[PDB]
């Protein structure tokens, strides 16, 4: 059965980064090496053990309508099970085209390298428009993983999801961090904090990124791709399996196509 | 007291030659940013230009007259400032919107011709500096020992100042730009200062002696007659033929060892002064070879010099690795390459004497020998690099990476050891040159009888 919208907040995800060099690259050895090192130590908290992919449990699923399903479609990407629109209460679609190459400033480079930003979520019209002017939920727990790709610290916005929990316990989404927070509505109060890495953020950020640098050359300057690193998401808590179609994945590949909800059993 | 003063002249050429040959590619790829394409093109064109300029500068020296100064010392005088500015300037990286890459090629070729213009007269000056063979051979052995010490000095200074001179590697997966630029600039400046001080101290004392009255002072032809008569002469070609194989083998060794030390049978990812150790051992050895040639060095010196490399180098056939004995092998090879550097390069004045008395009237043809000799050294460098790159390309080394396939180890092992073993063997066998101790004394008689 699928996890509750509050459970989406509570569950924690860890991300695993794998690096691959470019075979054709034969220059800029020292600076590219220093850049790879500084990127590698840029991500302090990651999954040490190599992740495991592929459908894990594959039971004839028992489930209710899911509260949130995430759908991503790509040209050439690994496929995971699909749930129709009826099953999921609300949907967030990952759209990679919005991402563009931004310049990653490095100390020793005559031509600064460029990397692609992570993809963005989109939502159907009329679902998150209720601002309700409630920013104060912005603060997450302390997190030391601020970087070019991944910033859970910045709290630009928090907006309500109208189609969920209008009467009470309204659920807020920060699109900037593509993260979500749940409230309980009582005058006396207690409230939890978010994990360092949200499951939704881990799902969205999962794409390979290619670092490119330009080298001055005869017949004009030329473009050389340094290296590229894949990112995969894995749940770090019990259960929390990515229900997708009939399949039940434990972790998600670098580029994943399908609709997934995180569930139990 | 001039012996040291002439000997110091080898260092200004040798230090720059070593610094460039070991660091220019790394600097081009890293500190400046040039594509592998243009980097390879710049290196190949620079070497080719050096080979091409060598005979032409030799001819212009031969044509040049004695005007209000030394016969060939004004060549050093014209070369030193412009060559030093070129060597300093090449290291600096130009900030330009367009046409940045050409700058490297232009100033590399220009510095190279200027330094050949320095070197060739400096090599030729050994004939003139003093007439008698004893002081002549003394001066040339001193020049050679100071040249190999120049090799050591240049490599050591550049490595220490700019940081570890290692082949870059791409770690297997399963410190500001302006600061390092300033480091290279500091290296350029100190090496340029060494060049300038060496050239001035050299020029201060040699005071070459002009030619005595010559039997045929008129009707010399520089363009054709010199070449034709040198071709007519046969021991000179026999000498260069014998020397080519030895020099090619040892330069092949010194070139490809830089990657052998890491990839194949290498327990250290850093050479860590191993090249400095072997070259310093050679610098220490060279006076021993001079004295050895005093003690029956007619051809025994070259025989023992080339042959001493064979067993110690081939001790890689046992191949069971032990680093300290491997260092000892490097020292052995140091004394072998010391003999390889000192003997055939300084045998040449005897050849030039034998040719000089054989045909009297031909005069002023001395620089042709030295020019073509250094040209053939550069040609050996070219063919060594060519065979090395072709073999590596044809077997293994498809990509530059820290892990390397097994094939590379077979090809580069056989290449580093067995190919120089057979090459030096053939060269030494073919090295039975005409003049021996008896021949030199016989030529000596006619030399002292002339005037
Ligand atoms: C998961 O999914 C994602 C997407 O869904 C996949 O990610 C994709 O990965 C692709 C890998 O190939 C990648 O495609 C390359 O993108 C590069 C990005 O190029 C950027 O920059 C250039 C211009 O840069 C210059 O910009 C201005 C001027 O414009 C200058 O001021 C700068 O200084 C720069 O110099 C733009 O053109 C792009 O729009 C981007 O902004 C491209 O470099 C690259 O194109 C080159 O290669 C193609 C074939 O390899 C070729 O058709 C094309 O013409 C280019 O050729 C250049 O390079 C060759 C040598 O490489 C050289 O000889 C030529 O002279 C020529 O210059 C590709 O287009 C996608 O961008 C990327 N998509 C993303 C991130 O959204 C991911 O792979 C996938 N993963 C898995 C596991 O499935
Ligand atoms: C699509 O996905 C994009 C990537 O995930 C996402 O982009 C994110 O957008 C925010 C933009 O928000 C601003 O960012 C400013 C960044 O400033 C940081 O860096 C500079 C220098 O590096 C420093 O000076 C800053 O101190 C800070 O470290 C930030 O300055 C702005 O903050 C200001 O505004 C807020 C109110 O909005 C105030 O609370 C602050 O106090 C301050 O006054 C502002 O936050 C970007 O920061 C974030 O990093 C981007 N994400 C990533 C992963 O990089 C897009 O928003 C998203 N779009 C859609 C439509 O989904
Ligand atoms: C998807 O990737 C595979 C692997 O490179 C390739 O063979 C296939 O043609 C790709 N699909 C395209 C290019 O439409
Ligand atoms: C909420 O979603 C359902 C279908 O998922 C739809 O009937 C309804 O109109 C939606 N309302 C809003 C405000 O998005
Ligand atoms: C979506 O969630 C709301 C939350 O109150 C609830 O009505 C139900 O679980 C879902 N609604 C629909 C129409 O699926
Ligand atoms: C919220 O908390 C209060 C007490 O802190 C409790 O009475 C109420 O049932 C809680 N509601 C939810 C939805 O957790
Ligand atoms: C939340 O924390 C306050 C502070 O101690 C406590 O008094 C309150 O009872 C807690 N409520 C819950 C539901 O944990």
Curated annotation (Swiss-Prot), chain A:
Q: Can you say where in the cell this protein is located?
A: Cell membrane
Q: Which domain of life is it from?
A: Eukaryota
Species the sequence originates in: Homo sapiens (Human)
Glycosylated residues: list them: 76, 89, 120, 163, 184, 190, 255
Membrane topology per record: Peripheral membrane protein
Whole-protein residues included: 58 to 322 of 538
- The name this protein carries in UniProt is Surface protein
Curated annotation (Swiss-Prot), chain B:
**What Gene Ontology cellular component terms go with this record?**
cytoplasmic ribonucleoprotein granule; cytosol; endoplasmic reticulum membrane; membrane; plasma membrane
Q: Summarize the impact of residue 47 to A.
A: No effect on cell sensitivity toward tunicamycin
For membrane topology, the record states: Multi-pass membrane protein
Which segments cross the bilayer?
Answer: 1-27, 39-59, 72-91, 102-126, 134-165, 175-204, 236-262, 274-292, 297-318, 322-358, 369-395, 408-431
- List cystine links: 169-402
Query: Where, by tissue, is this protein expressed?
Result: In placenta, associated with trophoblast cells.
Q: What is the effect of changing residue 286 to A?
A: Does not affect lysophosphatidylcholine (LPC) transport
Pfam families registered for this protein in UniProt? MFS_2
Q: Where does the record place it?
A: Cell membrane; Endoplasmic reticulum membrane
A GO BP entry is: regulation of phosphatidylethanolamine metabolic process
Effect seen on changing residue 268 to A = Reduced lysophosphatidylcholine (LPC) transport
UniProt-reported outcome of changing residue 116 to M: In NEDMISBA; no effect on cell membrane localization; loss of LPC transport activity
Q: What does this chain do?
A: Sodium-dependent lysophosphatidylcholine (LPC) symporter, which plays an essential role for blood-brain barrier formation and function. Specifically expressed in endothelium of the blood-brain barrier of micro-vessels and transports LPC into the brain. Transport of LPC is essential because it constitutes the major mechanism by which docosahexaenoic acid (DHA), an omega-3 fatty acid that is essential for normal brain growth and cognitive function, enters the brain. Transports LPC carrying long-chain fatty acids such LPC oleate and LPC palmitate with a minimum acyl chain length of 14 carbons.
UniProt lists the family membership as follows: Belongs to the major facilitator superfamily.
Q: Spell out the subunit comment.
A: Interacts with ERVFRD-1/syncytin-2.
Q: What is this protein called?
A: Sodium-dependent lysophosphatidylcholine symporter 1
Gene that encodes the chain: MFSD2A
């Amino acid at each position: 059965y699928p996890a509750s919208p509050r459970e989406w907040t509570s569950i924690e995800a860890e991300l695993h980064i794998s690096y691959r060099w470019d075979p054709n690259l034969k220059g800029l050895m020292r600076p590219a090496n220093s850049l790879l090192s500084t990127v590698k130590q840029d991500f302090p908290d990651i999954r040490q053990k190599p992740p495991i992919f592929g459908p894990i449990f594959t039971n004839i699923n028992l489930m209710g309508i899911a509260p949130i399903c995430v759908t991503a479609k790509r040209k050439n990407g690994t496929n995971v099970g699909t749930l129709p629109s009826t099953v999921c209460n609300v949907t967030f679609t990952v759209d990679p085209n919005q991402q563009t190459y931004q310049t990653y400033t490095h100390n020793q480079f005559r031509h600064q390298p460029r990397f692609p930003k992570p993809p963005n979520i989109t939502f159907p019209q009329g679902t998150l428009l209720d601002k309700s002017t409630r920013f104060c939920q912005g603060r997450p727990s302390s997190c030391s993983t601020r970087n070019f790709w991944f910033r859970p610290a910045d709290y630009n916005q928090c907006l309500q999801i109208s189609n969920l929990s209008s009467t009470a316990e309204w659920v807020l989404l920060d699109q900037t961090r593509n993260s979500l927070f749940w409230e309980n509505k009582t005058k006396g109060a207690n409230q939890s904090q978010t994990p360092c890495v949200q499951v939704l953020a881990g799902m969205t950020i999962a794409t390979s990124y290619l670092g490119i640098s330009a080298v001055s050359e005869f017949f004009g300057t030329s473009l050389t791709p340094l290296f590229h690193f894949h990112i995969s998401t894995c749940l770090k808590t019990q259960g929390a399996f990515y229900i997708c179609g009939q399949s039940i994945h434990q972790c998600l590949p670098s580029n994943w196509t399908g609709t997934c909800t995180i569930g139990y059993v | 007291c001039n012996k040291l003063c002439y000997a110091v002249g080898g260092a200004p050429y040798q230090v720059t030659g070593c610094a460039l040959g070991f660091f220019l590619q790394i600097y081009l790829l890293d500190v400046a940013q040039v594509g592998p394409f243009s980097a390879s093109i710049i290196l190949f064109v620079g070497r080719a230009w050096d080979a091409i300029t060598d005979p032409l500068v030799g001819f212009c020296i031969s044509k040049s007259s004695w005007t209000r100064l030394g016969r060939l010392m004004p060549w050093i005088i014209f070369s030193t400032p412009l060559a030093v500015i070129a060597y300093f300037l090449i290291w600096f990286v130009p900030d330009f919107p367009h046409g940045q890459t050409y700058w490297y090629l232009l100033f590399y070729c220009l510095f190279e011709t200027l330094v050949t213009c320095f070197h060739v007269p400096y090599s030729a000056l050994t004939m003139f500096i003093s007439t008698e063979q004893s002081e002549r051979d003394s001066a040339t052995a001193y020049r050679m020992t100071v040249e190999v010490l120049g090799t050591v000095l240049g490599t050591a200074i550049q490595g220490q100042i700019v940081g570890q001179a290692d082949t870059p590697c791409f770690q297997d997966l399963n410190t500001s730009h302006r600061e390092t630029q300033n480091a290279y600039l500091l290296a350029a400046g100190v090496i340029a200062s060494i060049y300038v001080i060496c050239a001035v101290i050299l020029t201060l004392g040699v005071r070459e002696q002009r030619e005595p009255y010559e039997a045929q002072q008129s009707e010399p032809m520089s363009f054709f007659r010199g070449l034709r008569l040198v071709m007519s002469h046969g021991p000179y070609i026999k000498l260069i033929a014998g020397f080519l194989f030895t020099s090619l083998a040892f330069m092949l060794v010194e070139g490809n060892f830089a990657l052998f030390c890491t990839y194949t049978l290498g327990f250290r990812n850093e050479f860590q002064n191993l090249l400095l150790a072997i070259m310093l051992s050679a610098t220490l050895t060279i006076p021993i070879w001079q004295w050895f040639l005093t003690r029956f060095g007619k051809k025994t010196a070259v025989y023992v010099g080339i042959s001493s490399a064979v067993p110690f180098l081939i001790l890689v056939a046992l191949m069971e690795s032990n680093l300290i004995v491997t260092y000892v092998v490097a020292v052995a090879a140091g004394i072998s390459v010391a003999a390889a550097f000192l003997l055939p390069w300084s045998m040449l004045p005897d050849v030039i004497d034998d040719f000089h008395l054989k045909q009297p009237h031909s005069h002023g043809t001395e620089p042709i020998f030295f020019s073509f000799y250094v040209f053939f050294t550069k040609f050996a460098s070219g063919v060594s690099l060519g065979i090395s790159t072709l073999s590596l390309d044809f077997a293994g080394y498809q990509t530059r990476g820290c892990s390397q396939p097994e094939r590379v180890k077979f090809t580069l092992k056989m290449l580093v050891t067995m190919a120089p073993i057979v090459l030096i063997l053939l060269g030494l066998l073919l090295f039975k040159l005409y003049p021996i101790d008896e021949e030199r004394r016989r030529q000596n008689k006619k030399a002292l009888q002339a005037l």
